[PDB]
Structure formats: structure tokens, C-alpha cells
Design a protein around this ligand. Structure first.
Ligand SMILES: O=C(Cc1cccc(OCCCC2CCNCC2)c1)Nc1nc(-c2c[nH]c3ncccc23)cs1
Lengths: 18, 337
């Protein structure tokens, strides 16, 4: 599922600015 | 009316914009409690004002780090804009000052924590819950854009939940007063409009795109464009393609297609009817825009309040002592701070 793919990704924590 | 409110709001803004508040406190007037958050230039700490007993959130920026990262102008923008604005959903800057080593912005403490935290934990917000928060962002952007300000950092990490369950917009580090178009590559990978990525000049419409990303993320529980690396996120943004979860209503999908719109001649917030294209959209039909402003609407979530200086709705951070140099650093660069 998209949720499972998101939860398993490295970008579920606080995201930094660029 | 809206036009009458906006006229008087512009007048109060420009007075403070032209003659900014400066050196309104001392470091020794506060007791440092805990770190509430971190960044590349420093941290945000829970402080206690010794004379009043009130708790505040104090953002501390190391000047040397600001200079090294080429963020002097962005830092001056942040403080000048924050001391000048006044809207119910923007965090209030109480004091500002500087010393030999750092810049300080003392703001009202919002103890309910970040929207980010409740969003990740809960998973996703229901459509009325996301609509409640989105409405507040719409009125906030309408206020800021009428002042020629672009926010450029909308994300759940920057939205704090207050004791009444309302949003307090935080971090004006990328906020800018610009009449025409601007070119700085800045923001958060997931929230960048295609025109920022494609190094085109851009305007206020990037904030409306960011609104589309925020509403999708609140309602789905994940952003519309995600990957492991920022480069992969940009490929997804610039290519049209947005997939919506099957639980999304037709109205939500329709509004998001008009916010996450590549074509600037079709993106909502930008067009002839302006902000009213959003306010009048069918997904917002139950929204009483005046009651949201007046904070008369019962919030779908009220966070737990243990005490005035309770930090339980925030994460724990590695504490580092504030070092104030005996010699003044970057004095010329931060002269107007
Ligand atoms: O600014 C920050 C994070 C933060 C804090 C300190 C230093 C930072 O360095 C800047 C790194 C680059 C940024 C430039 C602008 N876009 C994002 C990246 C960032 N936090 C803020 N918190 C508050 C705040 C007000 N009231 C509060 N109440 C509780 C918790 C926090 C707050 C205001 S600004």
C-alpha cells in the first residue's frame, strides 16, 4: 500500500529545509 | 468587510515594517528550561521570563552559522516580518535582542506541540479535521499575501497546536516581502512547487501549491510526492501525476487538482477571483470563514495541558549550553537586528 511504502521510507521524521 | 480589514491590517503592518522594534529584552531576563526544537543555526528553547513568570519559546541563532550558510538576508527578513505582523494564527514575537554570539527571538509558547507529531502518531486526519486546519491556513495566506509577503515554508513541522486546538504558524526563516517575482531555491523538498524546482521566477502561488501538499498530507497521512532522496521527490513533483487515496471525497480530489496545478493560469489562489476560488470551493461549503477567524468553531482536537511550562507534547533533544563570546561576531551583517 502507499501507507506501507511511506512508513518504510526514510522520510517519515521531521523534514529539513533546503 | 475583508477589503476594509485588509486596508487597516496593511496600515499597522507598514508602520512596524518601516520602523522595526529592536533590543526589547536581555538574555539574563530569562531562565532556560528545555530545547523544544533544533535547526542548522541553533535551537528553540522553552524559557521563563523572570519578572512576569510567563513561559516563552526563544529561538537562538548562531550568527557565525547564519553567515556560513549564507542566510543573513533570510534571517533579517524573518525578524523584520515577525515583529510587523499580527494575525490570530501567526505566533507572536514578544521580544528580540542580540549579543556577541547570537540572535534571539522570544515568542509566545505554544504547548500543544507540532501538527506533525499528532499527524504521524494518529496516521491521518478526517476531512472535517483537515478542513478545520486548512481554513486557518487559507485566512493566514490571504493576510500575508495582501502585505506582499510569501511564507515559503508551509509544512506540519511548522504548525503548532494551541490550547484551544487552533493553528499557530511558526518559522518565518524563508518569509519575504516581495512585490514582483523571486528566485531563491528554498523550502522543503515535499512542498516545493514545480516552478521553484525548475529555477523559474516565482511568486505567491508557491504558497497555494504548498497548501495543496498540506491538505493531501493531513487527509492521506503521507505527502503526494515522496521518495527516499530529495532528487527523486523533485522528479515526481515536476511530472504531473498525483494519485489520491480511494477514501478521498470527490470535492477534496477536485480542490487538490486545482491547488496541485502545474499551470499558473489555472492554479487556485492565483487567478482573477483570487482566494475566493478556494473559500467558495465545494470542499469548504460547511466552513464559516468569520467563525474560524473569531475562533468560535470547536476544534476537532484539544491537546493535553499539564502545566504552563509542560513540554510533554514535544520530543526530547540533546541539550547544549549557550556560549556567549567575549568578542562581538558579525556585527556589521546583523546591525538592523
Ligand atoms: O524556527 C524554528 C526551527 C529552528 C530553530 C532554531 C534554529 C533554526 O535554524 C534554521 C534552519 C533553517 C530554517 C530556515 C527557515 N525554514 C526552515 C529551516 C531553526 N522553530 C521555531 N519555533 C518557534 C516557536 C514559537 N512558539 C513556540 N512554541 C513551542 C515550540 C516552538 C515555538 C518559532 S520558530
Amino acid at each position: 500500500t502507499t501507507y506501507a511504502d511511506f512508513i518504510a521510507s526514510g522520510r517519515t521524521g521531521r523534514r529539513n529545509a533546503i | 468587510s475583508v477589503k476594509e480589514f485588509l486596508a487597516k491590517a496593511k496600515e499597522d503592518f507598514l508602520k512596524k515594517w518601516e520602523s522595526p522594534a529592536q533590543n526589547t529584552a536581555h538574555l539574563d531576563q530569562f531562565e532556560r528550561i528545555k530545547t523544544l526544537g533544533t535547526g542548522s543555526f541553533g535551537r528553540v528553547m522553552l524559557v521563563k521570563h523572570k519578572e512576569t513568570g510567563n513561559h516563552y519559546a526563544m529561538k537562538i541563532l548562531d550568527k557565525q552559522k547564519v553567515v556560513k550558510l549564507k542566510q543573513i538576508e533570510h534571517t533579517l527578513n524573518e525578524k523584520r516580518i515577525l515583529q510587523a505582523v499580527n494575525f490570530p494564527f501567526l505566533v507572536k514575537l514578544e521580544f528580540s535582542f542580540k549579543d556577541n554570539s547570537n540572535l534571539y527571538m522570544v515568542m509566545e509558547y505554544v504547548p500543544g506541540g507540532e501538527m506533525f507529531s499528532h499527524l504521524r502518531r494518529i496516521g491521518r486526519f478526517s476531512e472535517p479535521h483537515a478542513r478545520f486546519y486548512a481554513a486557518q491556513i487559507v485566512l493566514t495566506f490571504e493576510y500575508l499575501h495582501s502585505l506582499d509577503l510569501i511564507y515559503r515554508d508551509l509544512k506540519p513541522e511548522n504548525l503548532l497546536i494551541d490550547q484551544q486546538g487552533y493553528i499557530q504558524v511558526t518559522d518565518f526563516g524563508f518569509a519575504k516581502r516581495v512585490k514582483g517575482r523571486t528566485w531563491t531555491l528554498c523550502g522543503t523538498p515535499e512542498y516545493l512547487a514545480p516552478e521553484i524546482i525548475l529555477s523559474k521566477g516565482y511568486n505567491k502561488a508557491v504558497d497555494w501549491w504548498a497548501l495543496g501538499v498540506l491538505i493531501y498530507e493531513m487527509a492521506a497521512g503521507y505527502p503526494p510526492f515522496f521518495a527516499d532522496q530529495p532528487i527523486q521527490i523533485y522528479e515526481k513533483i515536476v511530472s504531473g501525476k498525483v494519485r489520491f487515496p480511494s477514501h478521498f471525497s470527490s470535492d477534496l480530489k477536485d480542490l487538490l487538482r486545482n491547488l496541485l496545478q502545474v499551470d499558473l493560469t489555472k492554479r487556485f489562489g492565483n487567478l482573477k477571483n483570487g482566494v475566493n476560488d478556494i473559500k467558495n470551493h465545494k470542499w469548504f461549503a460547511t466552513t464559516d470563514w468569520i467563525a474560524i477567524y473569531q475562533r468560535k468553531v470547536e476544534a476537532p482536537f484539544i491537546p493535553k495541558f499539564k502545566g504552563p511550562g509542560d513540554t510533554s507534547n514535544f520530543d526530547d533533544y540533546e541539550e547544549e549550553e549557550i556560549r556567549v563570546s567575549i568578542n562581538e561576531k558579525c556585527g556589521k551583517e546583523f546591525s538592523e537586528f
